[PDB]
Amino acid sequence: LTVSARDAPTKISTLAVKVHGGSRYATKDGVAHLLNRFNFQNTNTRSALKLVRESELLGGTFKSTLDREYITLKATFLKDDLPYYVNALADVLYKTAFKPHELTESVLPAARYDYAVAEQCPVKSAEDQLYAITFRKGLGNPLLYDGVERVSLQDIKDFADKVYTKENLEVSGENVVEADLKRFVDESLLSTLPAGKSLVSKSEPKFFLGEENRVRFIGDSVAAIGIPVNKASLAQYEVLANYLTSALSELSGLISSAKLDKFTDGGLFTLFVRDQDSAVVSSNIKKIVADLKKGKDLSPAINYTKLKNAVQNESVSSPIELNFDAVKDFKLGKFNYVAVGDVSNLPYLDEL
Amino acid sequence: AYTSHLSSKTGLHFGRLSLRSLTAYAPNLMLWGGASMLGLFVFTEGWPKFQDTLYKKIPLLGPTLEDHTPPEDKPN
């Protein structure tokens, strides 16, 4: 039960509760996605309709977001309604109703919409396979629910009993007095939660190199590569991503996107090439791979990547501390590869 | 001061109808009453019972409804 806050003379406040209950801890496929879409339904003391109508007259909103590591409950409100929104979030983690007709009428139709939206994007598909072939059963779990594995109402109740524990969540706030937040976090239903255990494992996950996968798709062709990164080489791949999508590189015109997703135990580097014509996708990916094998000098991009990292970290409260002062060179070694689209006209791994 | 709850009441109502909606519509429902009396006078102008008690007492438009035929010109 960690509580921290930052103060400021402003009008709006923000409260967040982060739970180590993302897709990488799911016991069944998509069970974490389903728990995300049940977070602000009826509780045992207040209805979903009553909460929406009451907070509108006070000036606040609610949201819940899912990724591969976290489930986040967030509230944005006016600075003087702090105690009201502490208890609203405490009741969600404590006494959610979990009714059989809420899943059939509200939760399942909402999950189908999310899955159908992400399925229409070939870049989201290629990123999912890159996570699947690099890490198989850890970070490689599917993010969204698609019905391939059956998940029942008791499964969602069981999953919530495991991740909603006092040792597995942190409380953060922006433009909030920290002494007042600590008082309200106590004398609340958060202090009466079960004291389970932290699900975080410190050891580096198992990864696999040299894999490949192909998916047929109607639309835009996409070629992507992925590289697992350890904890001591996160800064080197942070500079490379910014350099490859900046005016300092000649390959930035051939690259659609490039990023480094950071975890507390490592990361994954992703690079995507997307075009409507499969002849351009095949030609661009070959030039990028050959050029990266020769080697690149990343020293000119160190100052640029220091400012870009500051932009992203302003919103975040617990970013990874990086140095960037010792990044000198880079040479591509082994990587994974995924091709999505008109695969019959896209290259294989042995041809790159 | 910190606010931790909302204080509210419930307005008087019966179904789709409420006291506040009645109050807003009340001044306009009297004008519709006066527009129906005016429309009733138009269609009962030829009725001689209404002429003798209401319409013939209008200052300028009243006397023009009175008939001025001498008795020697009427068979009944």
Side-chain angles (χ1 to χ4, degrees):
Chain A
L1 201 57
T2 310
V3 186
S4 79
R6 262 208 64 119
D7 209 340
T10 38
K11 298 287 201 280
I12 315 289
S13 281
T14 282
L15 199 74
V17 173
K18 311 203 85 156
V19 187
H20 284 292
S23 290
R24 84 186 295 186
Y25 305 107
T27 82
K28 334 201 76 168
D29 277 5
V31 73
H33 181 208
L34 286 182
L35 177 70
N36 196 60
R37 283 294 201 183
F38 237 118
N39 266 353
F40 285 110
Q41 300 278 345
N42 299 313
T43 71
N44 279 324
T45 57
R46 193 206 282 128
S47 189
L49 175 88
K50 176 165 182 174
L51 169 84
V52 167
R53 303 275 181 108
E54 255 178 301
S55 54
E56 269 175 0
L57 285 151
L58 286 183
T61 38
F62 289 103
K63 208 211 314 184
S64 69
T65 319
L66 169 87
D67 42 329
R68 326 196 87 111
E69 157 86 50
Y70 281 120
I71 274 176
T72 322
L73 288 177
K74 202 176 181 175
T76 307
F77 50 95
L78 292 154
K79 213 217 178 96
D80 289 345
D81 305 318
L82 173 80
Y84 177 88
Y85 292 85
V86 161
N87 303 311
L89 293 187
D91 295 350
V92 157
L93 282 104
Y94 197 91
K95 38 167 81 150
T96 309
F98 287 115
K99 291 293 180 145
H101 63 79
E102 269 138 47
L103 173 87
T104 315
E105 283 154 25
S106 313
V107 174
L108 280 186
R112 297 190 264 256
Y113 174 66
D114 297 348
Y115 178 70
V117 165
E119 153 208 318
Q120 279 330 98
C121 193
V123 171
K124 304 287 270 205
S125 304
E127 186 192 336
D128 284 357
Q129 330 258 345
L130 274 176
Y131 268 95
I133 65 187
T134 306
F135 329 87
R136 281 168 179 182
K137 254 218 165 149
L139 290 153
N141 287 342
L143 196 75
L144 300 188
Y145 164 86
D146 50 343
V148 165
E149 197 167 3
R150 312 191 310 285
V151 173
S152 79
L153 171 77
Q154 189 66 225
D155 289 349
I156 309 162
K157 294 198 230 197
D158 282 5
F159 188 60
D161 276 335
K162 157 182 143 159
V163 299
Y164 285 171
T165 49
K166 236 199 294 173
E167 303 250 33
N168 209 41
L169 50 97
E170 71 102 27
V171 181
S172 189
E174 283 299 322
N175 318 330
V176 168
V177 168
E178 194 174 346
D180 292 333
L181 178 57
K182 290 198 232 51
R183 226 183 68 237
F184 292 139
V185 159
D186 297 57
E187 63 185 342
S188 183
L189 285 189
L190 283 166
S191 74
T192 37
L193 274 177
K197 78 190 181 83
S198 194
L199 293 193
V200 164
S201 64
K202 36 210 191 283
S203 56
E204 196 159 347
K206 174 106 171 75
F207 57 87
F208 303 83
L209 281 164
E211 312 286 320
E212 203 194 344
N213 199 221
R214 299 166 91 77
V215 202
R216 313 180 60 87
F217 178 79
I218 303 185
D220 279 356
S221 316
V222 162
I225 69 171
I227 293 138
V229 184
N230 46 322
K231 201 172 180 89
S233 64
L234 278 170
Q236 177 183 10
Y237 286 82
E238 188 47 73
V239 178
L240 171 79
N242 297 124
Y243 165 87
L244 279 175
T245 59
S246 92
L248 292 162
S249 178
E250 104 279 6
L251 300 166
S252 57
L254 317 175
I255 296 167
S256 153
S257 178
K259 49 170 182 157
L260 171 86
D261 315 348
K262 299 179 262 311
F263 306 99
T264 170
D265 41 299
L268 183 84
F269 177 80
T270 52
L271 187 141
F272 303 93
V273 165
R274 167 181 186 156
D275 187 278
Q276 64 180 20
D277 186 18
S278 80
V280 196
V281 183
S282 70
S283 198
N284 291 5
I285 196 61
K286 282 170 175 157
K287 183 178 179 180
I288 292 161
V289 160
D291 221 44
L292 277 171
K293 283 174 154 334
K294 285 167 200 149
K296 296 303 211 196
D297 195 22
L298 312 168
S299 64
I302 293 190
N303 278 324
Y304 181 66
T305 207
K306 282 200 185 192
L307 156 78
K308 283 298 177 198
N309 210 56
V311 171
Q312 323 174 20
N313 282 1
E314 294 245 65
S315 188
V316 199
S317 176
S318 179
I320 301 186
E321 319 328 343
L322 297 192
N323 200 230
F324 302 124
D325 287 313
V327 194
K328 181 54 179 168
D329 211 42
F330 172 77
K331 181 173 266 210
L332 183 64
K334 292 190 94 290
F335 57 95
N336 302 308
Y337 173 69
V338 178
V340 183
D342 181 20
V343 294
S344 98
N345 308 318
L346 298 183
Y348 295 86
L349 183 49
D350 72 328
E351 301 164 4
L352 293 167
Chain B
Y2 277 128
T3 89
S4 75
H5 81 97
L6 182 73
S7 69
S8 61
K9 296 167 190 173
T10 309
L12 289 179
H13 65 284
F14 173 47
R16 257 187 305 153
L17 191 47
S18 42
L19 179 57
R20 310 198 47 208
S21 178
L22 188 147
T23 279
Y25 269 74
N28 198 76
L29 287 176
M30 271 165 259
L31 302 172
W32 274 120
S36 317
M37 280 151 71
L38 283 167
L40 199 94
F41 298 153
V42 178
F43 282 77
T44 63
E45 163 83 89
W47 202 327
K49 174 83 144 179
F50 288 95
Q51 287 180 1
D52 305 343
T53 165
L54 282 183
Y55 307 152
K56 295 237 208 93
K57 276 173 264 302
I58 295 176
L60 275 97
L61 298 191
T64 187
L65 296 159
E66 307 224 279
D67 199 29
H68 286 292
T69 41
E72 44 263 29
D73 284 31
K74 302 140 109 61
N76 159 50

